[PDB]
């Protein structure tokens, strides 16, 4: 329901989404960089009466003619009263469609190796596994958690 684009003044309503232990808030230079540079990959979803169901950030930063023009996924979250609806597969489908439109060459992803929910979701969508970045997710005393770089190859094009 209501797959629109993440306007600023939705950084003040996305608090059923970012009060998760697995979802970060990134600061305001991060959100405004991803709103200025790549506003295509920044879909939010809204329920009948507000209640932001869940956003998806993302970028496409690489270099063509080295076969590395890839489209990232740099946040994905669904609010915990709106999960198991098929919303997260819808947002990943829209990011794969957008990053297939502007050329293509895989879609990457960074998921920590603690949650079998997200990893066993990306295995089922089609994402294979690439290298495991060691001590990637830093803190915020808590230990550093490794990250499965995940890559899904789609519709090879320069």
């Amino acid at each position: 329901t209501t797959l629109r684009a993440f306007t600023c003044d939705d950084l003040f309503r996305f608090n059923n989404i970012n009060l998760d232990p697995l979802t970060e808030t990134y600061g305001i230079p991060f959100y405004l960089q991803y709103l200025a540079h790549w506003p295509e990959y920044f879909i939010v979803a809204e329920a009948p009466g507000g209640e932001l169901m869940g956003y998806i950030m993302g970028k496409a930063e690489g270099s063509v003619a080295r076969e590395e023009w890839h489209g990232h996924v740099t946040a994905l979250s669904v609010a915990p009263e709106f999960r198991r609806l098929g919303l997260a597969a819808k947002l990943m489908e829209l990011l794969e469609e957008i990053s297939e439109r502007k050329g293509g060459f895989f879609v990457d992803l960074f998921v920590r190796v603690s949650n079998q929910v997200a990893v066993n979701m990306y295995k089922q969508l089609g994402y294979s596994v690439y290298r495991t970045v060691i001590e990637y997710y830093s803190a915020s005393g808590e230990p550093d958690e490794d990250a499965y770089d995940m890559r899904k190859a789609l519709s090879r094009d320069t």
Partner: peptide, 5 residues
């Protein structure tokens, strides 16, 4: 989810 900085 990426790192914060």
């Amino acid at each position: 989810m990426d790192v914060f900085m």
